[PDB]
Ligand binder design. Structure first.
Ligand SMILES: CC(C)(COP(=O)(O)OP(=O)(O)OC[C@H]1O[C@@H](n2cnc3c(N)ncnc32)[C@H](O)[C@@H]1OP(=O)(O)O)[C@@H](O)C(=O)NCCC(=O)NCCNC(=O)Cc1cc(O)cc(O)c1
Ligand SMILES: CC(C)(COP(=O)(O)OP(=O)(O)OC[C@H]1O[C@@H](n2cnc3c(N)ncnc32)[C@H](O)[C@@H]1OP(=O)(O)O)[C@@H](O)C(=O)NCCC(=O)NCCNC(=O)Cc1cc(O)cc(O)c1
Ligand SMILES: CC(C)(COP(=O)(O)OP(=O)(O)OC[C@H]1O[C@@H](n2cnc3c(N)ncnc32)[C@H](O)[C@@H]1OP(=O)(O)O)[C@@H](O)C(=O)NCCC(=O)NCCNC(=O)Cc1cc(O)cc(O)c1
Lengths: 423, 421, 422, 141
């Protein structure tokens, strides 16, 4: 009735055809690289116009009118086969993922457009956001053993239930806990377990002891995203950048959305609990972003916090949405726009950290802070506090644009370039 | 549909279950679980029903948003038009006559009701405007106040002077602990101050205490009356909700009058700047007050706190406003951890404008009053409040608050703690 | 249909009959003053009620159902001839303009009533804002020459490209850069040029050297609005007060909305860039306001910042909307409600200023900061940052109420009274 | 208050300053010893700040935190006159006289001062005829 889909279907084929005749990336001529470029743009511009009016329709078809909850991965894949050309196909992506970033076609950008339009929808957006707030199958599968054992070793996280505390230790001892797709899955599985476990009243996130020669014997919180993996094309826009923001990080705030089982579900459909973070060595990037979400934050006197890629990096997650609330416009732009690094012992560190303690007295302070967040008053109050600090609309709105903006940055020559030099 | 039918039954199932079962606190473990599951099923249906009919349930009570009904009149009218949805005055009288530890928690249903109402982009705004209209009691007293410039009340003393509406919290025997009567007086006073043309600026301060521990000294506020709360005398609707949608909201947006004067087309509400002077301390609802004033002074020896971090109820709208004043870290230190903030420490300036030695205070308070007199202050203050807190924000927060607080008002941990004061 | 248009018409006519028979503003008696005042009020009250349920219909008739973008000036003028009596006609405006504030009837207020209704609309509101975000006809006209010579020169601003930096210098050397209708026109033109010129990567705003005896050879950022003009009736509610907020100031934040020409438009219809402000001497009123939208602010050790008119001044633009975010609700009120001046060297300066430097090391601190905001990361991060700090709704709601609140202040007796004393 | 003027402040019982004022001992590179400042500044600002001010010409603004090491009250030019009149009435009695005498005896002993002025006498003389100072002074216009 509109023809946009038709126009789109053509441009998409008009691109496939060219990517079929044209040679391998890199081995292309200036004239070729520009012939394919104007192809994508013309097509991506149509995916926008198309979804700008048919988004709810396209979303309702994939979820039987918001009656079925689908996580990001499932969603973007169900829309691929149901709407060929709107978003990458499963295998059409396995190809991209097998090329280093500087060589990829930027197909994920199509998911950027898709997700942006889906989160911009006042009907579809909240529905998707709820889908991500539900416990992951992997967590529900391991719940019983965790309950019995109180322990779970994951590739990037060691989870332990002790004295009513879900103790999560990021343990990538060789890469300073640099982040990746598996790390995200492990964190979300751990966070899910902590929330479902009736033996957990409070959660804790800390960095474990490292093994790399330059930090052997010392703890480190996080060195942000794995730049090597990023340069190597192994950082999924969907299963990493978006997943972590709508999954475990959003869950640290709002908790997990369960089914109508336990009593009192009519007044509390989600299970949330307070979280404490202890920062050893430093919190950089994704790690520093994480701090803007915690109920209590401790740091070692010699630690620092930073969002370092001011000149050629990707948007620092949801930091752009939250830092202002914590440090004001001026300090936010100093940190994010100019890479300002903040040391634990300087006055302004108290804009992000509640307690800075000497390494010798650190462990004791953490244990002490874990006991002050137990009751129901805390649960009720943090829920009201989070509702006031970050409205559902504020967040949905931000993630919507972030979806496309972060996609474009994910294939920015300046970022691809910078990432390749990290050694 | 048939949700009403279901609710009516779940209610009946409960109503008859309470007639046969023995008195609360004499029931067995198996009995407490049965009445508990019954309430739970009843309350779950109340939410389910209102999630789709709240607007219709409201349109019937207010003649399609054509008649403004304050909180009390709304829930009362709801009780009679929809038996089972909310407690009748009768059911509630029985409840109010029992100490908190033994109530059935019927107020929770009112919490369920006001949440659905407030959540509506249609009913919520209409109910808020209703609460912003002047109290009938203030209208009655307006002519005598305009003439005398004085009104003695049970918890507040109002006096007009030099263009200033001086409200003095004077419960000298209990450090101005709040209760239902204090809220009625506060709102009555605020309404008078805003309606009197002779008043330009308002001032709220605590008066001299008679209690031996504070004899001769002023004390701003020691928060909610914990004794009454334990006693079952703190009303969800009449106290907890009334203060937030009533006089405290009027301190921010003024009073919505009728279209009966010039300029009403650009200023339907009459607002005025307020100054708060804190002597001794401001705890709980008293510290809560501070996040709404245009100017706040405090004597060098005072402190501010929201102490019940443990086993207390939600500190009103502090969870909504504190972040704005202190940022999320300090905000959580005060409310989640109970950190008390003293007047002389650096961060007190996040909440107070001026701290003065007790023997320089009166002078400083006078000087503060005269700086907020003009029409420039009125315009600026209205634009600032508009930017600092949007209609939707306040509304959405007050919506979940209605229920969340209702639930805390009946939590075993709260009841227990309150019983020890 | 609902009789509202008929009433307004009837009310506007009683107002014209009185202005026609009554003696001039200064020669009117108490009774005569009370009468024209009541008449003015009846008419204005009906303008509100009418547009309260017709704003969209009216707006749509002027913009062919939001298909054509009309700037503030054209919108209120088209509305004047399309709806005689709703807002002032070009002529009525001339009479008003030829008089000093104290003697005006206050017709601009009607435009303030109009603009508020248009901005409260979730349909008309955003559309009108996009209109103001598009480049001005004057800027489009001067672009090619600026792109060639790299220099423009206007009556209040001096624009110069250099090392990828657009250099805006406010040069009203005889009046500490006091603001007026022309300054606003020059500023927006300059901001458009800087944003459209592909050779510019970052802008810079700084006050130039003064010629006035009390400031000979010293740079001064801004003394705020021209109080003499305002007293003389020369400050336009639409062309100055509203235009600056929706025009250049809002462009420093969101960029200019262009046509679907360049590539990437599907994901960036607006062209935006980072900006740096350097304050010399002081930033007062309107000028202190400007600082709330920059990416970086540098100040001289001896400068101060203030929004002084606490007692009898007009609303300080969008400062009431933005100051809280920067300094919190207490400092914001101390600054606005009570005229608290903030010095470059006190601790709270860091709420509004990134760098404070001694006057002998300032030129170098400025240059050095112009190289820290070049990349695409900055562009993306800035866009996200402004999106979180100020949502379209929040900005739109504010300006809507501002249109009317400010209009009334521009005609307040106290304002007219103080400004007459400058 | 610059130089001799700034030196003077290290001796007063109360010190008020306008918000836009500054204090300095500017001739860090080619000037004479700043009077008795070298003997007194330390007492007021400590070793580090003293050497920043005297050894490197650090200028201190009235409105910055460390100005309270030298100034008791910084007031707005509009409210300055009133603050001065107010401070003048708080120093009248005999308690003040007795106390400032004991305070001054403790802050600066007779020996501390005599000793300092002794060396200063010759040091300041040599600087008074230092080619570097004679040179710098001739360029002032
Ligand atoms: C932390 C450092 C300063 C440590 O300096 P050193 O003491 O000099 O240790 P190094 O020798 O450099 O590193 C120790 C060790 O850890 C490895 N290491 C350190 N950082 C990294 C990263 N980021 N990735 C992979 N491996 C790393 C490093 O390679 C070394 O092993 P070798 O390479 O074999 O020698 C350095 O490692 C460093 O600069 N890392 C850069 C940190 C960084 O910039 N991270 C970027 C963060 N950017 C984001 O998180 C973006 C993001 C993340 C998200 O999660 C979400 C989102 O939306 C956006
Ligand atoms: C203020 C104090 C520290 C004073 O210590 P002291 O100098 O030791 O005086 P005290 O001897 O204890 O008290 C003096 C006197 O006042 C009485 N007093 C003091 N506080 C109270 C309160 N809160 N209620 C009743 N009476 C009180 C006290 O009972 C004494 O009389 P006696 O019992 O006969 O001796 C003490 O009274 C105290 O700890 N009060 C607890 C204060 C408190 O925790 N209030 C809780 C606030 N919690 C809320 O406001 C919750 C709330 C309120 C709202 O308004 C809205 C909302 O949404 C949520
Ligand atoms: C800046 C000053 C303190 C300087 O003091 P001095 O060193 O004493 O210099 P002066 O001798 O007074 O002035 C130098 C010179 O500049 C002229 N000057 C200075 N300020 C002004 C202003 N504001 N307008 C016009 N001319 C000015 C002044 O008239 C002198 O020339 P002469 O009159 O011929 O002598 C003084 O000029 C002054 O007090 N100006 C008042 C500043 C002021 O209050 N501006 C009001 C700001 N109020 C707003 O911006 C309101 C506003 C603006 C907006 O843009 C938007 C909005 O929504 C609201």
């Amino acid at each position: 009735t509109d023809g946009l889909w038709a126009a789109l279907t053509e441009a998409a084929a008009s691109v496939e055809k060219l990517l079929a005749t044209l040679p391998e990336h890199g081995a292309r001529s200036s004239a070729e690289r520009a012939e394919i470029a104007a192809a994508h743009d013309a097509a991506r511009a149509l995916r926008v116009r198309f979804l700008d009016t048919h988004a709810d329709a396209v979303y309702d078809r994939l979820t039987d009118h918001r009656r079925v909850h689908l996580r990001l991965a499932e969603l973007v894949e169900a829309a691929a086969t149901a709407f060929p050309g709107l978003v990458p196909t499963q295998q059409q992506l396995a190809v991209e993922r097998s090329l280093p970033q500087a060589a990829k076609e930027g197909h994920e950008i199509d998911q950027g457009i898709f997700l942006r339009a889906v989160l911009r929808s006042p009907l579809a957006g909240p529905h998707l956001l709820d889908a991500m707030l539900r416990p992951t199958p992997r967590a529900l599968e391991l719940l019983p053993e965790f309950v019995r054992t109180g322990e779970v070793e994951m590739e990037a996280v060691h989870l332990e239930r002790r004295d009513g505390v879900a103790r999560l230790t990021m343990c990538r001892d060789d890469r300073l806990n640099a982040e990746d797709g598996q790390q995200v899955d492990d964190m979300e599985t751990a966070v899910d377990l902590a929330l479902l476990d009736p033996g957990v009243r409070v959660g804790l996130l800390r960095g474990g002891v490292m093994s790399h020669p330059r930090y052997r014997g010392k703890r480190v919180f996080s060195a942000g995203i794995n730049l090597k993996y990023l340069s190597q094309g192994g950082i999924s826009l969907v299963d990493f950048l978006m997943r972590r923001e709508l999954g475990y990080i959003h869950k640290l705030v709002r908790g997990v959305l369960t089914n109508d089982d336990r009593p009192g579900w009519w007044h509390s459909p989600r299970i949330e609990k307070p979280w404490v973070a202890a920062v050893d060595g430093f919190a950089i990037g994704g790690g520093a972003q994480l701090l803007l979400v915690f109920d209590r934050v401790l740091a070692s006197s010699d630690a620092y916090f930073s969002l370092p890629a001011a000149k050629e990096g990707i948007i620092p997650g949801a930091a752009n949405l939250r830092l202002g609330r914590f440090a004001g416009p001026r300090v936010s732009r100093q940190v994010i726009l100019e890479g300002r690094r903040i040391w634990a012992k300087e006055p302004e560190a108290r804009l992000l950290v509640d307690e800075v303690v000497e390494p010798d007295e650190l462990d004791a302070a953490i244990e002490r802070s874990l006991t002050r967040l137990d009751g129901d008053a805390v649960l009720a109050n943090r829920r009201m506090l989070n509702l006031a600090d970050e409205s559902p609309d504020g967040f949905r709105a931000y993630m919507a644009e972030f979806a496309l903006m972060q996609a474009l940055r994910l294939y920015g020559h300046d970022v691809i370039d910078k990432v390749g030099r990290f050694g």
